[PDB]
Every structure is written in C-alpha cells, then in structure tokens.
Design an enzyme around this catalytic site. Sequence first.
Site, short mmCIF file in Angstrom:
data_model
loop_
_atom_site.label_atom_id
_atom_site.label_comp_id
_atom_site.label_asym_id
_atom_site.label_seq_id
_atom_site.Cartn_x
_atom_site.Cartn_y
_atom_site.Cartn_z
N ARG A 185 0.83 -1.25 -0.04
CA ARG A 185 -0.10 0.03 -0.11
C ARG A 185 0.78 1.19 0.22
O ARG A 185 0.51 2.36 -0.44
CB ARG A 185 -0.88 -0.12 1.14
N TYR A 240 -17.07 14.87 -15.10
CA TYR A 240 -17.59 13.57 -14.81
C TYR A 240 -18.50 13.49 -13.81
O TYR A 240 -18.25 14.25 -12.74
CB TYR A 240 -16.41 12.59 -14.60
N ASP A 251 -7.92 16.54 -15.85
CA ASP A 251 -8.28 14.87 -15.94
C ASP A 251 -8.18 14.77 -17.28
O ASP A 251 -9.02 15.09 -18.24
CB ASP A 251 -9.76 14.84 -15.48
N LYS A 286 -10.35 3.58 -18.85
CA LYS A 286 -10.74 3.89 -19.92
C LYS A 286 -9.19 3.41 -21.17
O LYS A 286 -8.97 2.57 -21.06
CB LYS A 286 -10.92 5.29 -19.99
#
Lengths: 391, 391, 391, 391
Positions: free
Chosen positions: C54, C107, C179, C204
């Site tokens: 992590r 978005y 973005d 995407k």
Amino acid sequence: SDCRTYGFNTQIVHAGQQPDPSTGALSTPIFQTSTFVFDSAEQGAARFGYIYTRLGNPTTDALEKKLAVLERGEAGLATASGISAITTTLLTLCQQGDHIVSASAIYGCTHAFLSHSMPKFGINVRFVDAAKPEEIRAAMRPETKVVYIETPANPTLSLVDIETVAGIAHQQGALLVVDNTFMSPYCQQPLQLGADIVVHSVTKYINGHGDVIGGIIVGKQEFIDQARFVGLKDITGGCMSPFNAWLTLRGVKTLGIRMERHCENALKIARFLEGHPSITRVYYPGLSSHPQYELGQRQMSLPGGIISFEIAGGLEAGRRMINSVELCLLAVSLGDTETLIQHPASMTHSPVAPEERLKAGITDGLIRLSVGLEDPEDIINDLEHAIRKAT
Amino acid sequence: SDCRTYGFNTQIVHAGQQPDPSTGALSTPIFQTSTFVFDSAEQGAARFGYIYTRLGNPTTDALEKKLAVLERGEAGLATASGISAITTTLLTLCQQGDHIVSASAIYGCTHAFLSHSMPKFGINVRFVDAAKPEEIRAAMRPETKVVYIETPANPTLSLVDIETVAGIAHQQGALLVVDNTFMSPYCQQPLQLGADIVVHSVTKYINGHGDVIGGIIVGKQEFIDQARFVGLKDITGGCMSPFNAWLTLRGVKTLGIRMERHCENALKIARFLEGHPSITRVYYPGLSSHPQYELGQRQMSLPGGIISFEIAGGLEAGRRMINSVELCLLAVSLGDTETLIQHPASMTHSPVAPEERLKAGITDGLIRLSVGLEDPEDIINDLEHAIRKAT
Amino acid sequence: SDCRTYGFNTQIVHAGQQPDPSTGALSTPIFQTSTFVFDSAEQGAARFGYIYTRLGNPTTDALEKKLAVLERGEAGLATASGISAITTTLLTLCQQGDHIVSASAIYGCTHAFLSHSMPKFGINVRFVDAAKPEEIRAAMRPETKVVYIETPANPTLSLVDIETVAGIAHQQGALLVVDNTFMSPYCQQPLQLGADIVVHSVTKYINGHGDVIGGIIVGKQEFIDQARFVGLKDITGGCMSPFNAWLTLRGVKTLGIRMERHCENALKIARFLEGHPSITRVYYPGLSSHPQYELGQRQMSLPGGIISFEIAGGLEAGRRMINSVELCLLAVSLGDTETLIQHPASMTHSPVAPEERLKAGITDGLIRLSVGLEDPEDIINDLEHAIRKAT
Amino acid sequence: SDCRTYGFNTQIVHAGQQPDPSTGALSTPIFQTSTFVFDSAEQGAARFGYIYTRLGNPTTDALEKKLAVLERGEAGLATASGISAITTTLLTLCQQGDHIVSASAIYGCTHAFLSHSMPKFGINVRFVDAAKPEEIRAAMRPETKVVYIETPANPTLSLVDIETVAGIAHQQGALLVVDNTFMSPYCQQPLQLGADIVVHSVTKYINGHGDVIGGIIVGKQEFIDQARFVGLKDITGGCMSPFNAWLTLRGVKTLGIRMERHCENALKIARFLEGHPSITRVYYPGLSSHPQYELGQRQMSLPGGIISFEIAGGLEAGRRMINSVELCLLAVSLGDTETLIQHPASMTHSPVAPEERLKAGITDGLIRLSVGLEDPEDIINDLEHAIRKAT
Ligand SMILES: [Cl-]
Ligand SMILES: [Cl-]
C-alpha cells in the site's frame, strides 16, 4: 446475429465472446475452476455444459471459438503450449506403423519430436524440402497419414505453397497440417487454401504480449473432438489453464492493429537493412528479391513481422552486433510487443558443428529479428549503431 | 539453513520458497512471462538461469522444489494436469516394444491411456490386482520397464503395499511409479517406501482449492531431467502455467492443516455411516474392518479424506440420495474445501453395462464422498437427511 | 540509456520497464504480495526499496514510471480507481477553508464529490463554464488552491484551453489539475501545456481492455510524495492492486496503435453521422464545425475515440435506436476495444428532470458512442440500421 | 437453504458462494471486468444487477456477503485496503464540526488519519485509554458521532471491553466502530457484543496468505449502502479489485483451520517465552497473567496468533535478536502463514524519540511476533537460538 458474418477486425474483437448472460459482465469471466457441479444425478449423466476443466471450460471455449472463426475452421482446441498443439494433433492422428512427411525447415523442438520421439513410438517421418512440392509427393507412402509444413519457415523465411501441397497430400490420401504461428490468422489462412488442420503457438503473435505459453489447434469438429477427448484426455494432458486462455483472449483483441504495425515496422527495417553495405543478405517476404516473392503475395496478406539477415564478418561480427544493441532485447521468442533479436550461431546453436549449422541454413553471420511496436526509427538507429560497431 | 532439515509443517510453508532477493517480496512473484532476456551472446549460449517458460520458470521452480522436499525426492516437474504428469512420465520411460504392469484399480482416464493409447504406440500393458503383489510378479516380462500403482485406489479405497511392490519391481529390473494423489505427501511418502517416481494430480489435495488443474512428478534428478527436456519438451508439451504454479504454491501452504481437518472430518463421517442401518458397507481406511487396515496404519499417517459407501436399495436409492443432499455438492472432483459427492452408477458410468460396472467394483448403490472442511455435524445432518429420504 | 529519450511508441512499450535483473524475465513480474522482508534490523530502519504494497510495489512502480514518462511528468501514483486519483489529489491539496474552481462539464461522480463531499469537509467549490477562461478568472478567491478541468468534456465534447487556463491559475497562485482520461497521454499532454497535475481513470483508454478499474496521478515528485505518503496512506487508502497494475501495463503496451485505430474509426463514423439526415447534430473534435475546432488541432494530436450525436425524434427515438443496435453494446464505460453506446436521457439520467438534463447539455436525443476497434464499416452499418429503425 | 443457519466452519466454506448458475463452475468466477452491458435502454435505467465494478461486482459481492455472514452483520463492503475500510467508514459518517472518541492504542496509520487528516477537515478527535471505559464516557461531546476502538491493541495486546463500550457509546448517541483485524470473525464478533460497524484489514488473517492488500466493512444495510454509494463512490474511490476479492475468498476458505493452528502455535510459543529467564515480559491474551485475562476469555474464542515480548538488554538486545533469527522472517505485516517478527524500536520507530516510544508502550526491548503455521518446535528453536545469541 452470427459472428462469422462480420469483418475480420470485428471478428477479432467479438468472435467467440459475448456479455455474460447472468451478470452482463463484458469481459469474459475467468472461470478459474477445476470443479463443475451438477444440479442432479440426471444432469450429471446427461453431460457425461461443463464437467471438469481439462475436458472443457467456458473461458477456454471462448478462445477456441474465436480462433476457429478467425481461421475459418469449424472448431478449436486450446493447449498448454505450441508443442502440445502439434503433438496432441499428431499423436491423435498417428499410431505405430504410420508415416509422416514433414518439411525440414521447421521449429527446432518440433524437429526433435519428429526425429526422435515419433520413431520410438513406431511412427516414421521423412523430412523433405517443402519449398519443392515434388519432394513431398516423392516421399509419400501407403502409410502416410500426414504432411506437416510451416510457412514462412526459419531461418531464412522460405515459403511453402499451401494450396499446391494440400492438393498433393489429398490426392495421396493424407491430411495437411500447417503451423501458422509466424503469420497468425490475420496474415494467412491455411484452411482456406486446403489445409485440414492448423496449429499455432499462441505464445507468439496471437497472444502477442510475451506472457503466455500456449497453443491452439483448429480444424473440423470431427477431428477436434478426437484431439480433445483422446489426444488431450488420453495422451498429452496438455490442457490450457483458464487464466492463460483469458490472457490470450485479451491479447488477441489487438491482433489486427498489432500485425499491421509489426509488418509496417518490419518492412521499413527490412528496406533499411537491404540498403546497408555491411549487411550481405536480408530475408523478408516483403522484399521483391525474396525467391518466392510472388507466392508470398498470393498466400499472405502481409509479409510478417520477422526478418533474418546476414551481417558481414561471420560469427564474431554477429556476436559483436547482438552485444552492441541497446534497445532490441536478446531473446529467442518472437511476436512480442518488444523488438527481440538473436544470433543463433552464438546463442542457441553454439555447440552445434559449424558445418551442420550451415546445412540447416544457419550461417555464422545470420541474425533473426522479431520486430516490435516501437518507433521503427528507434529500432533502425539501434541496429545502425550496433552494425557499425560490429563491423 | 537447509529446508530439508525442518519439521514437515515448516517445510510445507517454507520449502522451495524465500523472499525475493531483489525486492524482498515475501510472496513468490508470479513470473507470468514466456520470454527471458540475456545480457549478452555469451550469457545466452551459457544457459542453452532461465530461457523460456516451457523449459523452466522461477515460480514453477519453487513449486517443484517444494514438492520434491515434501516427497523426499531429488527433483520435481510441474505439468498441465495430473494426466500429463502420468503420461509425460510413462512416455519418457517407455518406447515401442516395452511393457508396463499396472494396477487395474486406477483412475479412469489413466486406464484409457494405458489400455488404448500405449498399445497403439507399441507399448503393451498388463493389468493386475495390485492388492495381490504376487499378481504383479507373475505379470512381469523381460520387457517390463515400469510397475504402475495407485493407493488408496478407487472405488472401494483398497490399498497397495508400496514397499513390497517396490522390492518385487526392483528385483525384476523395473521402476515403480506411484500415483500419490489421494494421500498427498502429508499422508503418504512412496519414495520413502522404495518407489522410484511419484506423480500427483495437484488438482486434488495439493492445491486443495478446486481452482487449478495441474500435475507434479517427483523423482531422481537424472529422471526428472529427462522428463523435462524430452518428455515435456519433445512429447507432451504439458507445461504448467506460472499462474497455476503460484496458485498451487498458495494452496499447498495449508496442506497440513487441511489434511488434518479433512481426515478428522472423514473419520467422524465414516463412523456415522458405519452405524447407519440403511448403509450396507463403508469403505474407509480408518475403519478397523478395512481388509488392509494394518497395512494402512503402517503406510499412511492418516486414513484420508475420501469415503465410499453403499446405500441400501441399489441404483434408485443412490440416485435419490444424491438428489436429496442440500449441502454436499454433486461433482466428480475430490480434495476440495467443499464436500463433494457422486454416484458413479448414475452419473459417470450410466452408459456402462451394469455387469461391467460390478466387475470393476462399482455397485449400483456405491456413493463416493470427498469430505471437506465444513462442520462434520452439518455434513452428517445432510447425509442423514438424504439417506432417510432415499430409503 | 534513458527512456525519456526514445520516440513515443518506443516509450509506450519500454518506459518504466526492463527485464527482471535476477531472472531475465521480460514481462514485469506480478509482485502479488502484501509483505516485504528485511535482511536485518538495519535494513528495515533504513527504508522506514520496498516495505508494504500500500506504500509501494515493484509492479505498480513500473506503471507509475511509465505513465510519468508518457505525460512528461516527474512521478506517478497509481490508485484503486479514477475517482480515487481525483480525490486523493484534491484531499491531499485542500483542507477546510480552502476553495476550488471547477469546470461544470465534468464526470458525474467527480461532480458529486465536488458538490457534496468537499463542502462537508469545509472545502468550497465554484463551478464555471471552463470553455470561457474569463469565468475561471472571475471565480478565483484568495483561498483558491486548485483549478480543476476536464477536456474534452462530456456530453458534447466541448474543450478547455489548457495553456490559457494554466496561465490564469498560476498568476492567481493556484495549481491546475487536468483530468486527461478521454485523450490519454498519446493524444494530449496537459503538463506540457502548463498543468501541474494530471489525473486519469486508467479504466478507460490507458488500460483499454475493459477489465481494470484504476487511476493514475502524475505530477512533480514533491507533490506525488505527498499524495502517496499522506493522500493514499492517511486519507483514501486507495491503492492499486499489483495485478491491476500488471494488467494496465499490459494494456498500455498497445496504447499507440489502439488510439490510432480508435480515432481513425471515430472520424469515419463521425463523418457518416454528419451526413445522415436523421441526425440533427454530431459532436466530435475532428469535425471542422466543432466550436473549438482550431483549439483542438493545437492541443490534441488526434480528435479522440468518442462521439456524441443527437438523433431526430427526441427521447423515444434515442431509446429505439439503442434498442435497435446489434453490434454496438449498451454500456456506460468508454475506451474499451468494443464499441459502446449509451443514451443518457433514458439510461443514466432517466430520473432526472428533463429540464435539468437540458441545462446540463443532455438533450433527450443525445447518444454517446465510444468507438472500438471493429471494422468501421460494420459499426456504420449497425448505426445506419438502428437509426433507420428508430426514425 | 440459508447459509446463516450452518455451523461456523460450514459458513466459512460456503457463505456468500454457490456454483455458477450458468456453467456450474464451483469456484466463484473472477469477474475481472470494468464494464457491464445492458440488454436494453429499459434494463439500463432499471438498475441505475450490475453496472460498473467500482459500484459492484459479482466476485466482490460474494466476499462481502460471506464476511457479513461471518460477523453476523447485514451487509459487507470490500475496499482497496484496511486503511480505506476505516476512512471510507469515518468519512461517510462524519463531517466538519463532528467529533470522534478514539482509543490511543490503535494502528499507526489509523492514528495519522485521526490526528492529522480528520482535523484538517474540521473533524475533531479525542484520544483516550480505551482499556478504561470511563475515559471514553468522559470524552464524549454533543458532537460525538463515533467511538472507535481496536482490540486486542498493539503493542502490548491490551484489550477493550466491547460490550461495555458499546453501551456507553449508545447511551450517549454515538456509533461504535471496531477494528477486528487482529482477531478475525473466527475469534471475535464485535457486532454480537453491540458494535455497530466492524472493519478489517483483510490483508492480515482473513486473507491470511500475505498476497492481498484489502479491507472490509460490515454493518447494517442502511449504513453500508451509504458507505458504498457515497463513501466509496464520492469520497475515497477505494474499491477492491475483483482479483483481490477472489484471492481473499480463496484465503478465507481456510480461516477456521488457520486460526486454530495460529492460536495453538502461539500459546505454545507464549508459554515458552514466559518460561525463559532472558525474557522480562510476555504479552499474550492466552497467559493468565494478562491484566484483562478474564475479559479476553469472555470476549474472544481464542487468544490469537500475535505475541509481544520484551527481551533483556534493551535496544541492542532486541536488534541482535531479530538479526539472529534464521526461520522467522523480519517484516512488519501480520496474519501470514509464515512467522513474522519485528523490533519496533529499531525498525519502524527508530527515528522516534526513545521517551516518546516509551509513552506509547514501545519499550526498547519490545519484540512483536506473528506466529505462523510452521511446526512450533522449529519456531521455538529459532527463538531460543536467537535469544541466547542476543543476550
Ligand atoms: Cl489459498
Ligand atoms: Cl492486453
């Protein structure tokens, strides 16, 4: 509709696949299971659907169906490796007393199976120059079950006329098996030219990402059923894991665009090499001086992503060149997204007597190149730098 | 230190594995690659380290080393399936004209390979009742290369005396190959009893999680090298994928605790069944009425997780019973964490003539149970409910 | 050498990756581990190399480095999702009392975070029409830390002038976050135009294969270190799994060839739609009638794979059209190898008041199309068939 | 039937899982997809089934359902990490102006989120000694939304009385959130004792195999829906990948047998350490001298697999000891199948002022041990050897 009806790129993307009925998941699920459960005793006997992955699996089924569509064959059978595709096929078809006529210019590990393994099982093999279809005809015997060919073939990318050889094999009552690994279904379709069975190492272009070992067999349903329920189940046990099938499905999504780029890059690199005074020969079906150029144009939609060439200065020059590349990677695989290079005389056939290598078309200066998806300018610059240094 | 020196549970966890030198990663990395790169021409020839996964892979190597340690063998070789472990072994060892003596009570798919495939390659096989070592001796010929046994054996969990059979095989110049799938190395160690080669379907207990098809071969380095560089490379092509090797490494971490629980549960269930008036027979090595009970106690550290039993009322009762369970799952696999149940007469051998099934020890009322890790009280309740309904 | 020096396709293939030093494995190994081991107490303190996934992982590191190279940024940070990329970034940068100026055309899930979540943490957000840089300037406050934009933006593929907005943000002391999901680094490089931080949903185009949810953040080392050691570690916990990183590395290998084909296909389809009398409007940056066409030509190397268009007949026509396609798949994702289609008014915004949808540029007849790698002729035929039926 | 009705081991194996309806596959398929497809416009709006993995996924759903059953909660929500489980929970529940009462003895990274991150979002946190329920009561304010506790707690394995604290929290109008990572649902069930929400790092025992980073939240459906559709979707984006969910499902199959063995081994090792004259203190709930021993016996079904102990000779002795183990591995994780050891004063808290470590219960000689599945005799021998050397 029917996936057999769409254009080839559409088939590459969609054939054999659909959203999961139960969940709508678009990606083919990874059915990483060994066990399948029955709802009843009756439903269990009925199938004896799925039962056990080594017999069948929904993920692997999708890959098999896709490749069958792409090769214009009835059915597909996935395997643990390219080798297993070949041996499952041949060990299914042949038994003691049978005979095979094989090209001499074939994958090295295939050659071991054919020259050493088969005869120990009572299956005899004749090797011939398959660039000369008359040698195939002359080698056929009443016991011949199979003619086996690879095209293009290492190490000089010579070709075999599939349609002509198919006609010869069939007239003499044999099946034609073609290893279509180098081309992929995007560039060559042996079944459309009369071959009975096509095999691939999907390890190369079909997967394309250098992270799967696997094979595929495509042919008539009747044969594939035997290859599955006898060849895999009762001889090789060479099943493909569902995860490997899933990765291969994923890799093949981009087969069309990958092959286009591999071949565009390779043609550029081949032409560069052909213009280079330190390079004595360049073997590439896309060059008009290829001995079987016109055959290649009829049989192959693209000239491929593999090039072989001979550097001036023999063994030491070849060694120096591969030791001097900075971008191309030294490896023996092909069909990956990275450009790979090898010098067989120093890397894989080093122990082999120089005169024996020569007979097999492996000269001391021969280099094999698997052209990747990099900018061809960068690959050319790397080659130019290494060649200059090596010479 | 040396992993060969730790206790068996410690070996299960650690053998063949260590933190990644480069990164310190504790989990064995998944080397999901087909291609390996060389630093130079020299380093390439030197190996001809790793080269190509179908020849070897660091993830798969870890599994092979671990299983070799657990079976007290020199070396291991992972394969695409249990079947491939068996056929890679036997096809490596045998050629046309050779002979095999095999137990009759063996895995069904093995029986097909031995009865149909081998003879078509000129390799003859005699089947004998291996519960009677004298039948093995009597069947041996000058051409016998291998004695092949499975213990315990389906469908009544009969045993074979490994040490005694090994001595017989060796005196007559043959190797002993033992399929140790049912037991796992945790419960039986055939090499320690004189066997030469052990094979497993790791699909069962070694993986234990019902999500991997795979096999393993363990034996002397000299043999394993041949099984690898000829058997896999030049005959079956049955390589294991690195992901499957990684999952198997992961599954085997819990082999000790899984086997303990499987066997504790199975003994409880077997005793329940033996006390049930609707159950005519119970086959379980842990029951003292087992015909070879004492042999089992010497040869096996635990009686296993598999039970077979006969329900009163024959075929219809067997069908009704498996259709009446609510927790046990209907499937043909074994060694999973879930309890699996099957009724061979109605599910897998339904087409087979009733009289032929009988000869093979498959009675109409025979049920096979692979006991899982559930609470045995829940499994017993499920069985009790189904038996009551079925009768 | 230095991967920053090769051509863009070469970088796509090679950047951030190299053969495994220890084994030579070409594929980046999947370091599917949680735990990393130290050789000593000293080596443990020294790092407090790797420690715990992590915080970092070699597989994920390769992806981060590759994407940093492709965006021409110093460093990358992979995340569990596109959303997590955005929120890890903004929650790292902002605290109670701070302010953000955001485009309105963003978005949907981003809009929820910005409109509802941020204010509940004392972080205020102004929404503006970012197609008008003056609205951005006018909305800036002494407390403004970040200007946030997306380009092209749904649902009509309007653009934002990155360089101009960057200059405005910087003069007023704020960072610009862009973005870049729709474009990918292959088609647009916001950092090169003055943006400070780029975020993507790799879900995407970067992954491109419809089988990974994930995000990436790229920016200066100083910021990325904070996003990692505070944002991920101390706020969102949104780490990417090594397997997802590996799949994304694999997917991005073909980014160049995929984007070329997506955009070639999309341009063809857009021109078809623009010529269709049943289609009132077509929104595609590759069409010269796009309101910001020239800006698009300067800022984007290709016009993208996404098209929106309005079908005659409003809501019912839109519904009928998406119910009439046979090849295009009904889904809300984008950037997959399959062509995906959606009708927001009936599928995702059905509950939303028609007048509110209209204000947000979502008309009743608006259809969004994510163009895949199929033959464009097949997609066009499917669209033509569906449009005819719907009208 | 209903999985809520079977015994706990049966639930561990079966809860949340069933054979795939469509194929019969026993293993839960890996739905490694981002995209879900709709059959129609209507079916798309209806769901707005599955839609998009970051909102939901069939593989992850199985894990969530299983863990909800095991904790006796209504619903589960999987996350990218243990940290994300905690922060998604708390950021869903709290907004600026709210207050949290937290134990001081908590996971270090949790402490950072609570001490630094929360206050920057206007959420204030009081830290108290949760071993003293009166300190919790005294710290509660009108704004207190949550009481947050961990039990057992590092670094001396002190306990918190869940039922008593729950009653206090509820009387004062707050929710109780319990981190149950150390115990797993097999050993402690906080919801059954009055907790409202349970969180885990599945990275530890639930997965158990040291190869997954992930978290889980379990609680009422009403809360979990908010944690999912707002917390994950609109704040952290901390979704779990389907592959990680599948691995966790696989790991948890053996939770019961693993915990039994971990705890059996740990008790043996703890007793060995307690008898060792070079060891000043041993912290283990299974030892009767534990300050809260009786509470532990009521609240925990087993004393756990974690032990802390103090070696004579302070910092240098601790360093020498961890540098002298040969089997135990130096790492900071816990709950793996391998025995892990760490010395916080020299490894993780080395930069921290010695006096500050002391206040936090971290003495210079404190060693933490995560006991694995090895033979305890081998672990004891390794410890004995290292202790002798270190002293
Ligand atoms: Cl596992
Ligand atoms: Cl891919």
